[PDB]
Write a protein that binds this ligand. Structure first.
Ligand SMILES: [Mg+2]
Ligand SMILES: [Mg+2]
Ligand SMILES: [Mg+2]
Ligand SMILES: [Mg+2]
Ligand SMILES: [Mg+2]
Ligand SMILES: [Mg+2]
Ligand SMILES: [Mg+2]
Ligand SMILES: [Mg+2]
Ligand SMILES: [Mg+2]
Ligand SMILES: [Mg+2]
Ligand SMILES: [Mg+2]
Ligand SMILES: [Mg+2]
Ligand SMILES: [Mg+2]
Ligand SMILES: [Mg+2]
Ligand SMILES: [Mg+2]
Ligand SMILES: [Mg+2]
Ligand SMILES: [Mg+2]
Ligand SMILES: [Mg+2]
Ligand SMILES: [Mg+2]
Ligand SMILES: [Mg+2]
Ligand SMILES: [Mg+2]
Ligand SMILES: [Mg+2]
Ligand SMILES: [Mg+2]
Ligand SMILES: [Mg+2]
Ligand SMILES: [Mg+2]
Ligand SMILES: [Mg+2]
Ligand SMILES: [Mg+2]
Ligand SMILES: [Mg+2]
Ligand SMILES: [Mg+2]
Ligand SMILES: [Mg+2]
Ligand SMILES: [Mg+2]
Ligand SMILES: [Mg+2]
Ligand SMILES: [Mg+2]
Ligand SMILES: [Mg+2]
Ligand SMILES: [Mg+2]
Ligand SMILES: [Mg+2]
Ligand SMILES: [Mg+2]
Ligand SMILES: [Mg+2]
Ligand SMILES: [Mg+2]
Ligand SMILES: [Mg+2]
Ligand SMILES: [Mg+2]
Ligand SMILES: [Mg+2]
Ligand SMILES: [Mg+2]
Ligand SMILES: [Mg+2]
Ligand SMILES: [Mg+2]
Ligand SMILES: [Mg+2]
Ligand SMILES: [Mg+2]
Ligand SMILES: [Mg+2]
Ligand SMILES: [Mg+2]
Ligand SMILES: [Mg+2]
Ligand SMILES: [Mg+2]
Ligand SMILES: [Mg+2]
Ligand SMILES: [Mg+2]
Ligand SMILES: [Mg+2]
Ligand SMILES: [Mg+2]
Ligand SMILES: [Mg+2]
Ligand SMILES: [Mg+2]
Ligand SMILES: [Mg+2]
Ligand SMILES: [Mg+2]
Ligand SMILES: [Mg+2]
Ligand SMILES: [Mg+2]
Ligand SMILES: [Mg+2]
Ligand SMILES: [Mg+2]
Ligand SMILES: [Mg+2]
Ligand SMILES: [Mg+2]
Ligand SMILES: [Mg+2]
Ligand SMILES: [Mg+2]
Ligand SMILES: [Mg+2]
Ligand SMILES: [Mg+2]
Ligand SMILES: [Mg+2]
Ligand SMILES: [Mg+2]
Ligand SMILES: [Mg+2]
Ligand SMILES: [Mg+2]
Ligand SMILES: [Mg+2]
Ligand SMILES: [Mg+2]
Ligand SMILES: [Mg+2]
Ligand SMILES: [Mg+2]
Ligand SMILES: [Mg+2]
Ligand SMILES: [Mg+2]
Ligand SMILES: [Mg+2]
Ligand SMILES: [Mg+2]
Ligand SMILES: [Mg+2]
Lengths: 209, 56, 119, 123, 65, 114
RNA sequence: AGGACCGAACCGACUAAUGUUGAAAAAUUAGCGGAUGACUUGUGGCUGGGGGUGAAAGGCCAAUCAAACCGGGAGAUAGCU
RNA sequence: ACACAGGUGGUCAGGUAGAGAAUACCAAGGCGCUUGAGAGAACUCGGGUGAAGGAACUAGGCAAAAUGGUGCCGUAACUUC
RNA sequence: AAUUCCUUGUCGGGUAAGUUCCGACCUGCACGAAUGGCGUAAUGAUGGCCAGGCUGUCUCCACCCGAGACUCAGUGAAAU
RNA sequence: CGAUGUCGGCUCAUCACAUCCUGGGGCUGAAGUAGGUCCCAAGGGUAUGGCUGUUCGCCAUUUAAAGUGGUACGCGAGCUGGGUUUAGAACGUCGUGAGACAGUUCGGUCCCUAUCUGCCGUGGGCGCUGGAGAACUGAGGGGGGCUGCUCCUAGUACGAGAGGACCGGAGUGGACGCAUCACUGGUGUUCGGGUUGUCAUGCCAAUGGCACUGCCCGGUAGCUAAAUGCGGAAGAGAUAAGUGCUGAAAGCAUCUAAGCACGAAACUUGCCCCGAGAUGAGUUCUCCCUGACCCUUUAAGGGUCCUGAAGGAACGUUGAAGACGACGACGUUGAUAGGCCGGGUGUGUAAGCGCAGCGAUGCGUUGAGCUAACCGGUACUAAUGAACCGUGAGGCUUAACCU
């Protein structure tokens, strides 16, 4: 089953009648127009290639704009690709809107999370700090010991060290979809999706039911 | 915190493989005084994009 | 991490920038074109240009604010008398950054920040 | 939000004025206990004669915290004093038959039906 | 277990100290006197004689008196 | 944004009264005990009001049965049935957090008669 | 009145952090103990190496002390490297 | 050894607050410490604040926090008074 | 016990729990009377233990302000 | 021995199975519940405290369990220095004595800016055979895997009672991980107010400087956790111990030799992330270049005049991206940043004037004024006309094709 390319507008809440504040994330999901359907004979697998949004005519390039004028479609801002399942067909310029999610109950919002920069091990891997007093010399937030004495004469691969934290793709799974507001092109999922405000979210229905 | 073998003039030259300067790309020609300057900076005579912004 | 923040530090503590930009907002009003570095000029726009928007209503309450932001009466007597009705219709953008190359002492990117209606 | 070494007030007339959480029950490495959570206490101060005595080791259910509890609409109920009602070691039911001060709606169950049926104001 | 006292570096690494917990009677004897645990296990097995025999000869004089 | 500030102003309440810090407000909240809906009252000094539109709150500090109790009601919540201002108070501060160390004659905030 | 009390100059140097190719071959910063006494300090004098001096630690005697430094015997000697 | 955060005896001692030669801010005066410009990562140093708990830390309340002034009421064991 | 090896002696106090501590017992491995014995008010930058106050000490670290770190320009070391 | 720093702790670990729990079994002197023991199994998980320098240990209290070991009895160019290997001092003791003690006791400097391998990150170069913008297939590699209690089945089966299930389902917790700021909060030396000492603005008034942001009290965005969303799975393949079916060699018996089915948190997948430098350099879609000549040492050759494409880079305005490069947005045909305008929010009734008051002060003007990073707008200033780099139809050989 395909998913739809959203955008994180922000977070707010939906009060029930009961007095239950549901933290929902307003994902606007505009019309996802297909640009290229892929098949087993030509492409080796089955998937559609959707796009969303609009883009400046002096900023789309001629290789990129010729890809859309083949499909008969307005130049969107990106090109995402959704693996089709079995018994599921779409055409070359069909516009897909948020009423696909109108009957699902849990989605998997995949976004590009925030960027914490070069972040040390107390922030990245949740190491403990060393003792802030009792004599500690220049070693309050360091990783400490990163190996053994001469039997491994090496740090092992996949060592938890400092470095870049975030700005990576992550997937938050099984978010309970609260409202499919197809009037104003929205989708409200209960919880905290990755990425900052205004980033692209790739909302797909849940693989784990 | 200190070496055990003197690194060669091969490794020194390879370390300096990225320490080479990139020149100026192109100088922008002003359209009134005609002289060349850095792109988006004023000239050395006080002109910028035609108009005289400050006397010399 | 500097997510969504604004305001350069300029390697100065917060009681120095407030007393550096106050000297620099005065000297930009007094001379109408000053040559400073490019980050100290881009942060000067957030100080001088609100001192000219304050100058569009000559009142005793606004004289005492523009004197609290500058502590120089000659600068306040130029903001409200001269630079007030000089920029009486311009919706912001009261001053102009003119990049002027590099400084021969420390290779700083310099700039001329001038008022718009100077010459 | 009660951890070990927390001095708690006592919210009944079992006999203590000041008890100390020495263990947080219910799981491995468990840090904190909200309301309705069983802690193991020791009695650090007692009324001069009563049902419990200075130095006993027994269980208590925390009925008021200063970190409070968050209702499902996000609304929080903060108190001022960390206070608990002293249960028993075997039966795990309260000792003093008269609760003092308010309790919360997160306390009531078939387990603590006997506390919210002795409290003055169940918030 | 390691010995606990002065004596340097052979103290510091090697164990050379033995505690014996005689399980049914509960009598423990914690001998750390010499530098080798062979002269220090035998001096703690020869004290479980004098702390079990002399505590059964002193139990059958409680039920003698 | 704009879509955020449109999903909020279609779930706000249109009848929140105008109360300030210091007012002895009297909030009647719903209480669902068992399977019955009754309406419990909560009266005390407002010590803070946090305005964010839909996410608005107000902290009410009373002295219930000797023990001081605070409670941060979400203002546009559907569980606050009726906010009612019984007494209006006079303070020169916006968040009355000095009333936490005061009990009795020292927690007297005088009445604003305006 | 006081080898009296609190506390600056001044004399010290108890803890900590920094520093350890330092700013400094022992110091800075936050504290610290004495502060009319067996106190402290200026300027000169005096005691010399098996000797000085030492409220005594083998301390100190010119960044050197279980016997100074400089020259000399001297290219001591070295079954050791 | 340095245009070195050390060391160096005397003399003069203004204002307001203060018991004062403390300390805060100032006068006569003298300076901004001979590398600067950006950036606002880890991590280190020097600081500020902190939810609920308050020695659970640890070799040890190390270090931080805390206490801090004057007037008056009041002040225990012990005591060589 | 600045002395006790066995030893974390045993009993009592304090602790939810106390190899330390305090009070006693004496079976002093190996205290003892000016290489002084035992007391001792005051005093100590003295050693051990406890309690209130207090707090990032810690559960558990979060943020912020400055000096470095990082980048550009100038001068330009070192151990190995 | 021209130095291989040493016990315990702390911070990280990582492997082994002789497994503490969770999983699967056999046997039981296994009725049930609970056990006993043995085989299979390393996927995860595997206490906080009192005393001691302690490892060890006892104890308090948890826990599904608090495994045993390797790794220089891991880990001091990561940290601690209580202990122990120094110098001071004392006691007990031995010695006439200097001194001595696996006897004790108080005090006692822990250095190094990373060249290399290693590892975590992030780039530059060229390669992939014309160049370029994108979208991916996934060989490979990593991450994740823990689990309690309660309820239903059922007070059923079992049992004489006491007690009390397997199998299966539903909740809701601990611990851990990831994302996030809507909420509750922390910070918020860039916002607003109170206030002390002083100084300055000619003075009163009003304000600013400095005293840790002077000391405070609130607090926007941001980042954050204690805050709240989600996660571990289900299934599938082939199995371990184990139980089988049919079944001979061996007329019986037999799970195995031919054949066949079952079987666990392990294994391969499923789930998330990276990923064609996967040189075995892959695939698909799109775009762009259709000029003339010389020369000889004829070839995948140098050179010349014209030409300079798609695109990229640079520069600038910059970013919820960021050490620097990178990545992303924008560049007048323009909301990229600042300003401006309106709002929000925070502080909590500015100044000036008037009045009440002998005055401090109070009140009206007044929810006033100011209001950072926020939200919605607006071209007001800065984002330049160019130029620079990239070229001009893409080798050879066979094959199916082609008219
Ligand atoms: Mg960032
Ligand atoms: Mg720690
Ligand atoms: Mg050090
Ligand atoms: Mg430190
Ligand atoms: Mg090897
Ligand atoms: Mg070598
Ligand atoms: Mg280089
Ligand atoms: Mg910004
Ligand atoms: Mg600088
Ligand atoms: Mg200041
Ligand atoms: Mg020895
Ligand atoms: Mg050994
Ligand atoms: Mg004296
Ligand atoms: Mg000092
Ligand atoms: Mg004194
Ligand atoms: Mg001599
Ligand atoms: Mg000397
Ligand atoms: Mg001699
Ligand atoms: Mg001779
Ligand atoms: Mg010789
Ligand atoms: Mg100098
Ligand atoms: Mg002074
Ligand atoms: Mg300097
Ligand atoms: Mg910083
Ligand atoms: Mg602090
Ligand atoms: Mg705190
Ligand atoms: Mg608190
Ligand atoms: Mg402890
Ligand atoms: Mg501990
Ligand atoms: Mg201290
Ligand atoms: Mg302090
Ligand atoms: Mg003795
Ligand atoms: Mg005892
Ligand atoms: Mg202790
Ligand atoms: Mg004793
Ligand atoms: Mg004697
Ligand atoms: Mg004698
Ligand atoms: Mg004596
Ligand atoms: Mg440089
Ligand atoms: Mg050796
Ligand atoms: Mg040798
Ligand atoms: Mg060597
Ligand atoms: Mg096995
Ligand atoms: Mg069994
Ligand atoms: Mg493993
Ligand atoms: Mg494995
Ligand atoms: Mg698996
Ligand atoms: Mg494991
Ligand atoms: Mg204790
Ligand atoms: Mg090991
Ligand atoms: Mg070994
Ligand atoms: Mg080791
Ligand atoms: Mg070690
Ligand atoms: Mg090492
Ligand atoms: Mg090493
Ligand atoms: Mg030590
Ligand atoms: Mg490197
Ligand atoms: Mg690369
Ligand atoms: Mg894998
Ligand atoms: Mg928040
Ligand atoms: Mg927010
Ligand atoms: Mg807050
Ligand atoms: Mg603040
Ligand atoms: Mg905030
Ligand atoms: Mg002032
Ligand atoms: Mg005045
Ligand atoms: Mg000044
Ligand atoms: Mg606060
Ligand atoms: Mg499975
Ligand atoms: Mg058969
Ligand atoms: Mg047969
Ligand atoms: Mg199978
Ligand atoms: Mg599982
Ligand atoms: Mg527009
Ligand atoms: Mg703008
Ligand atoms: Mg408001
Ligand atoms: Mg004001
Ligand atoms: Mg007014
Ligand atoms: Mg009014
Ligand atoms: Mg307002
Ligand atoms: Mg505004
Ligand atoms: Mg905006």
């Amino acid at each position: 089953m395909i998913g739809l390319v959203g955008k994180k507008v922000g977070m707010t809440r939906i009060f029930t009648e009961d007095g239950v504040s549901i933290p929902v994330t307003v994902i606007e999901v505009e019309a996802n127009r297909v640009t290229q359907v892929k098949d087993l004979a030509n492409d080796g697998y089955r998937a559609i290639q959707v796009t969303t949004g609009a883009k400046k005519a002096n900023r789309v390039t001629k290789p990129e704009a010729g890809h859309f004028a083949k499909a008969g479609v307005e130049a969107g801002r990106g090109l995402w690709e959704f693996r089709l399942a079995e018994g599921e067909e779409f055409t070359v310029g069909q516009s897909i809107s948020v009423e696909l999610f109108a009957d699902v109950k849990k989605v998997d919002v995949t976004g590009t999370s925030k960027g914490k920069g070069f972040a040390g091990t107390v922030k990245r891997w949740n190491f403990r700090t060393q003792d802030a007093t009792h004599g500690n010399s220049l070693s309050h937030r360091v990783p400490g010991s990163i190996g053994q004495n001469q039997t491994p004469g090496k740090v092992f691969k996949g060592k938890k060290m400092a470095g870049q934290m975030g700005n990576e793709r992550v997937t938050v799974q099984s978010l309970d979809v609260v409202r499919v507001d197809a009037e104003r092109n929205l989708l409200l999922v209960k919880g905290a999706v990755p990425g900052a405000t205004g980033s692209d979210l790739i909302v797909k229905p849940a693989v784990k039911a | 915190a200190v070496q055990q073998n003197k690194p060669t003039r091969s490794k020194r030259g390879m370390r300096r493989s990225h320490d080479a300067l990139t020149a100026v790309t192109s100088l922008s020609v002003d359209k009134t005084s005609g002289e060349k300057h850095l792109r988006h900076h004023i000239t050395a005579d006080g002109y910028y994009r035609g108009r005289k912004v400050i006397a010399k | 991490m500097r997510h969504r923040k604004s305001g350069r530090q300029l390697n100065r503590n917060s009681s120095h920038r407030q007393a550096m930009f106050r000297n620099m907002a005065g000297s930009l009003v007094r001379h109408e074109i000053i040559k400073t570095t490019l980050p100290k000029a881009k942060e000067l726009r957030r100080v001088v240009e609100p001192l000219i928007t304050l100058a569009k209503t000559d009142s005793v309450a606004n004289r005492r604010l523009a004197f609290a932001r500058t502590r120089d009466n000659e600068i306040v007597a130029k903001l409200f008398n001269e630079l007030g009705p000089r920029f009486a219709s311009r919706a912001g953008g009261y001053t102009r950054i003119l990049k002027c190359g590099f400084r021969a002492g420390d290779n700083a990117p310099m700039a001329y920040i001038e008022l718009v209606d100077r010459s | 939000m009660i951890q070990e070494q927390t001095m708690l007030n006592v919210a009944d007339n079992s006999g203590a004025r000041r008890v100390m959480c020495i263990k947080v029950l219910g799981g491995s490495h468990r840090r904190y206990a909200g309301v309705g959570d069983i802690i193991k206490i020791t009695i650090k101060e007692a009324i001069p004669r009563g049902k419990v005595k200075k130095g006993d080791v027994l269980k208590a259910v925390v009925v008021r915290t200063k970190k409070g509890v968050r209702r499902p609409d996000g609304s929080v109920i903060r108190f001022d004093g960390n206070a608990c009602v002293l249960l028993n070691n075997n039966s795990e039911q309260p000792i003093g038959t008269r609760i003092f001060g308010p309790v919360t709606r997160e306390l009531r169950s078939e387990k603590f039906m006997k506390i919210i049926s002795l409290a003055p104001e169940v918030l | 277990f390691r010995s606990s006292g002065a004596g340097g570096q052979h103290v510091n690494t090697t164990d050379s100290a033995i505690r014996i917990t005689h399980l049914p009677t509960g009598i423990v004897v914690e001998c750390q006197d010499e530098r080798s645990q062979h002269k220090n296990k035998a001096k703690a097995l020869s004290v479980l004689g004098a702390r079990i025999h002399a505590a059964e000869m002193a139990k059958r004089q409680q039920a003698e008196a | 944004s704009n879509i955020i500030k449109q999903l909020e102003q279609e779930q706000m309440k249109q009848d929140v009264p105008s109360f300030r810090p210091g007012d002895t407000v009297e909030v009647k909240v719903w209480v669902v005990e068992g399977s019955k809906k009754r309406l419990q009252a909560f009266e005390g000094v407002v010590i803070a009001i946090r305005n964010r539109g839909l996410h608005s709150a107000f902290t009410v500090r009373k002295i219930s049965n000797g023990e001081g109790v605070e409670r941060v009601f979400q203002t546009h919540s559907p569980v606050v049935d009726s906010i009612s201002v019984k007494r209006r108070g006079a303070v020169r501060k916006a968040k009355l957090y000095y009333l936490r160390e005061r009990t009795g004659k020292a927690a007297r905030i005088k009445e604003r008669l305006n």
